[PDB]
Amino acid sequence: MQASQFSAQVLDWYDKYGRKTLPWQIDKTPYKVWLSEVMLQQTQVATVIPYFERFMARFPTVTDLANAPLDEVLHLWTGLGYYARARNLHKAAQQVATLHGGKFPETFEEVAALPGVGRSTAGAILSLSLGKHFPILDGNVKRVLARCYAVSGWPGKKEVANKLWSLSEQVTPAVGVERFNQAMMDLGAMICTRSKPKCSLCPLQNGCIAAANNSWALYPGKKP
Ligand code: SF4
């Protein structure tokens, strides 16, 4: 599928069916988007929402989080699992307070330099909170792109990852980047699921190679 067609069909779908009322989407800021992205990395949205609201009430700014004792952060994290995420969250808040005067940095390299924040999470923070023109590539996005364009191979292999990052850059637009990047996460989470994807509900079904061949189980590739 032509990349400009891909982007328009996804945005039209988002306009009518997309999620726009999660707490981190109202009055968005870099701090709220970063916090939600770290919580969502390994945890489902319904479990995260009460933790996100408790963290924003106790720590209204990144400086408040930075100045708090680590044990308090770990106590509030209890139940989210994967506590290396919380240790890195506190260190990244301290780096923003120390290097950036308590205001989130706005360049890709300074955001990716935060502990716990990789290439996709950095692009997510800058695109969703500030409109900057970066793509994302989490597991939801990998699945949609690898099925639509029939990208086989394991994404843990550098050459396969490079191909998926280039495809994501190509289909991600500048106008509407915040809507498109959330829409791709919504599609992978609710429609293009790991088992038995709901192709009849998908705005890419008219050009997707996996749908044409009933071959979604091949994409993305698994580890050998
Ligand atoms: S048509 Fe089916 S396999 Fe293709 S991107 Fe949509 S849900 Fe995934």
Curated annotation (Swiss-Prot):
Its quaternary organisation is: Monomer.
Quote the range of the complete protein represented: 1 to 224 of 350
Please state what the protein is called.
Answer: Adenine DNA glycosylase
Which top class of enzyme applies to this chain? hydrolase
The residues annotated as the active site are E37 (proton donor/acceptor)
Keywords carried by this UniProt record: 4Fe-4S, DNA damage, DNA repair, Glycosidase, Hydrolase, Iron, Iron-sulfur, Metal-binding
Residues of the site described as Transition state stabilizer: D138
Q: Is DNA repair one of the keywords UniProt gives this record?
A: yes
